[PDB]
Structures are given as C-alpha cells and as structure tokens.
Design a protein around this ligand. Structure first.
Ligand SMILES: C[C@H](N[C@@H](CCN[C@H](Cc1c[nH]cn1)C(=O)O)C(=O)O)C(=O)O
Ligand code: NI
Length: 510
C-alpha cells in the first residue's frame, strides 16, 4: 500500500476506483457522471446548508412581480479553452437547454422560462411566465443549468452533443481512455478556491476483489459512492483498508431511501396486478436486511421519504414483513400453490418475475439473492440479473423490468424533485404508469407544487404518497449514506447537501 500512496501524495493526486466510466460529459443531458461534472462545470448560484449563495453570478435582483431575475455576473471568469464567461455565454447555454425542454420537465423552472436577454456584457436577465420562488434552487442544480463554452456547441446547440467539455470549474477534463480512466487536472486559472490537488483520476474497474486489491496496492487511493448509489468496497474491505493504517473512512449523514421499484406498467407480468404488488410488499424483511445483510450500517426505511426530510412531517409506515399475508394475497390474486410444485400458477402459467440490480454493488447483489430465496418460499420464480447501472437506468426509462433496486435522490431533491419524477420519463414514470388513478395523482403532483404554505404542501404530499404507497410501487428498505475512503493523511474531506459531489478542490495534503 505505502509505495503507490507515497508517489500520489508526492504528485498531489487522487486515483479513485469506480465501476463505471464517466459517460457523456455534456451536462445539458443526464448520462454523464454527476461528481465528474461538478468538478468542471458550474451554475449561476450554489445551494448550501445556509441557502442560495453567489457563484458565477455575483448578485441578482428579482422584479416586483417575481418574473424577472437579473444576474450580475462575475467578470473575471474564463472557460477552460480560454474563452470568456459573460452574459452571452449564459444566454446561449440556457437557450440550448430550453430547446430540449421535454428532457427537463422534471424541473418546473424549465416549463416557466420564457426568454433570456443580454442586458449588457456581464448582466443577463431571465424572464419567467409566472413568479416561482424555487427558481434559484433549481438554477443551482448540477444539471442542466451549468455552463459549457459556446465554442463547444455543435450546430449552434448542445442538444446533439458538444465538441469538447470546457466549463469554468476548478478542474478541467484531460485524457480520457474509454472504459479505463479519466483525468481531472487542476485548473491553474480558476477564478475561485483553487484546487490543492493537481490531479483526480477516475479509474474504471470491477468492484469486489479487484477494487480491493487496487486500493490495497495503492494503485487507487480513493473511493466514494457513485451517482447510482454504489460503493465499490464492502464493509469487510473497508475494515481491512483501515487496518493497513494508510486509509481513513468517512460517512455522511443519512441522505436517501433505497427501495425496490415495482413496475405497475409491465402489462405482460404479474407485477401489473395491484394485489400481487401488495403481496410483494409483505415479502421484504427490511429489519433483517438492515441488521444482517447491510451489517447495521443503514437504518431500515418504513416510508419513501423520512419524517425529518423537508416538507414531510408525518409518519406513514408501509406494509410490514408478513409471509402469511403475502400468501393469502397471492391466493386472492389466483396464483395458487401445491400440486407437486413449489411454484404458484394461474391459468397453467408459473409465477415468474425478473429483478435487476447493479452488479457493481455487493449489497444490492446480496439483497437480491436473499429476496430470491424468500420469493422461492412464496412460490415465485425470481430471476435476478446483475447489470451495469447504465443499463439499469435504461430499463427504468423504457419500462423493460418487473422489479429493480433503486434509491431516492437525496437532500437537494427529496421529496419535491423525486415526486416530480414519478411522472417523468427519465424518472419513475414507467413504474407509476399502470396505476388506475394516475391522472388524478399526477395532477395532485402538479398542484402540490403550487401550494405556498409549507404545512399545506406537506398535506398535499401526504395524500399523494398515501396513494403511491397503496399501489405498492416503491418498497422502502434502508437509508443510504455517502461513504468515502481516502488516504489517512488527506485533510479537508467533507460532504455537501448532495450525494452527487465532493469538494475535491478543498482536499489536501496528498
Ligand atoms: C433528471 C434525472 N435525474 C437527475 C437527478 C437524480 N439523479 C439520479 C442519479 C443519476 C445518475 N446519473 C443520472 N442520474 C437518478 O436519476 O436516479 C439528474 O440526473 O440530474 C435523470 O437522471 O434523467
Ligand atoms: Ni438522474
């Protein structure tokens, strides 16, 4: 371990282990690694524990009617190709985003942006259809309203890709070898807090033994939970790495709910039947999962968004583990047992379903194997399939799945953006599409977001989530945190409100 660690400390470098590549680094679409994109691209403002703060915009005014935001931009910023950041760059970026506004409909501000006007070189005006108090908060998201050099647009937009990946941030993208590595090099010209690290490299490899050995030999010296929730090192690997004396391990506050998604819209499978979904709701021993399978590292989750989360001020416990209840519900549904078979049948077909998990996640894999044994006791043939997180996301979008592991979006998004995503193609619309009352639930979601009083908004969320919970679309399991393994002599590793970034430009000493 020491040899590789010492070289990297000398070079002021981190090389992090990850199971997936950085993907499409165009931050106006959603495929690219979120933490990589937060290292190189920046929004107008930042959303912190202490609310909205200046970033590329120094200051802003809102009009009396709430419909015009004027942003007074820093005048000392360049993109990484040396081109200038100014009001025209802001306008061309926001306008490029708005050409693809169907992709961004999960974020309400995209449905309100009317136009953008350059008032002068460092002042830009954003006009909305109506007042919208969360505007600043949404403009603070790491996608899509962050700024790419206009020299990198293709055919006058970003909608079909970008030529290179120039932003304003503390790192710039260097060499990328597809499915192997990507370099984030110190931006020596950065307008703000300059990086104390010269290089962060993302090194792509499988999890399990190979990530562990890589970390143990100091070929990699850093790990963190990726944007899909996967930790490359299990609990025994973290223990052994700490036991070397060379690594430290840090863990954030609880940030999310990890859940099973049940596809109501999958017409060709039993999960499209509500009664079967309810049965499945009783087949998930979340207390045992959290205590025995996740080794007590995560608390069990009995609802989608914990009572402590913004605008959720209620306790609404979900279906409990109860295999007898499961069995009578399957019987009610016509899936009958016995007759010399383990598998339940209805009209002479066996009850089969396919569950999908991230093969890079040992904890997802272990839960999936447990649930396969449990489903077997109930007379379900569960076929489990470990896939890339990329391929899991594609199924979430298309609807090609019966059940999948997933997780909510964390402190900046839960509950409001995650609930919006219940009817978004690139969110969980697949899973909610088969609910009988979906028109009204969807309209309730639209309406909840108009309610200004926080207590009433909270009530509107409760009525939505009660009906989502009755449908058995989401089975909460545990609360996830972010975990970071880093060299023991690396100082200043800390967490933001997000599960999708780290302050790489503040970390130092190695
Ligand atoms: C818009 C929607 N999700 C948001 C925020 C939530 N991100 C997580 C994690 C993720 C990783 N890569 C893409 N999304 C999710 O969609 O489950 C975004 O990607 O910026 C999406 O992925 O299309
Ligand atoms: Ni996403």
């Amino acid at each position: 371990p020491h040899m590789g660690l010492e070289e990297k400390k000398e070079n002021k470098q981190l090389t992090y282990t990850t199971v997936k590549d950085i993907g499409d680094m165009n931050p106006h679409v959603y495929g690219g690694s979120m933490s990589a994109e937060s290292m190189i691209y920046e929004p107008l403002v930042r959303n912190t524990k202490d609310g909205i703060k200046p970033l590329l915009a120094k200051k802003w005014d809102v009009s009396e009617d709430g419909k015009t935001y004027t942003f007074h931009l820093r005048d000392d910023v360049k993109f990484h190709d040396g081109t200038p950041f100014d009001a025209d760059a802001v306008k061309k970026n926001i306008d490029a985003v708005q050409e693809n506004k169907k992709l961004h409909s999960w974020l309400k501000i995209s449905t309100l942006i009317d136009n953008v006007k350059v008032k002068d070189k460092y002042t830009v005006e954003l006009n909305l259809k109506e007042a919208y108090q969360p505007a600043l908060a949404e403009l603070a998201m790491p996608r899509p309203y962050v700024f790419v050099s206009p020299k990198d647009f293709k055919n006058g937009t970003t909608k079909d890709g970008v030529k290179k990946f120039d932003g304003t941030g503390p790192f710039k993208l260097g060499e990328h070898k597809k499915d192997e590595s990507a370099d984030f090099n110190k931006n020596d010209q950065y307008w703000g807090e300059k990086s104390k690290l010269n290089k962060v490299q993302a090194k792509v490899m499988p999890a399990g033994e190979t990530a562990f050995l890589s970390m143990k030999k100091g070929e990699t010296n850093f790990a963190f939970t990726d944007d899909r929730g996967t930790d490359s090192l299990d609990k025994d690997s973290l223990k052994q790495l700490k036991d070397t004396g060379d690594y430290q391990v840090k863990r954030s506050q609880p940030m999310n709910t990890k859940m099973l998604v049940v596809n109501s819209g999958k017409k060709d499978n039993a999960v499209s039947d509500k009664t079967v979904r309810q049965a499945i709701g009783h087949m998930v021993n979340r207390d045992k999962i959290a205590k025995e399978i996740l080794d007590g590292q995560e608390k069990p989750a009995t609802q989608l968004f914990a009572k402590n989360v913004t605008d959720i001020n209620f306790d609404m416990p979900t279906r409990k583990y109860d295999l007898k209840k499961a069995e009578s519900l399957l019987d009610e549904a016509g899936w009958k047992k016995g007759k010399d078979s383990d598998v339940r049948q209805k009209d002479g077909k066996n009850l089969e379903m396919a569950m999908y998990y991230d093969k890079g996640s040992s904890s997802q894999k272990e839960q999936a194997e447990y649930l396969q044994a449990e489903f077997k006791k109930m007379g379900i043939k569960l076929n489990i399939n470990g896939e890339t997180s990329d391929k899991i996301a594609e199924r979430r979008t298309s609807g090609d799945y019966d059940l999948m592991f997933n997780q909510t979006w964390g402190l900046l998004y839960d509950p409001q953006s995650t609930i919006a995503a219940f009817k978004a193609k690139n969110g969980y619309e697949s899973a909610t599409s088969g609910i009988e009352n979906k028109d009204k639930i969807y309209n309730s979601i639209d309406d909840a977001f108009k309610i200004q009083n926080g207590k009433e908004r909270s009530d509107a969320y409760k009525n939505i989530l009660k009906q989502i919970d009755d449908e058995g679309i989401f089975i909460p399991i545990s609360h996830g945190s972010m975990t970071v393994v880093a060299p023991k002599d690396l100082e200043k590793v800390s967490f933001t409100q997000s599960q999708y970034e780290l302050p790489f430009n503040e970390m130092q000493y190695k």
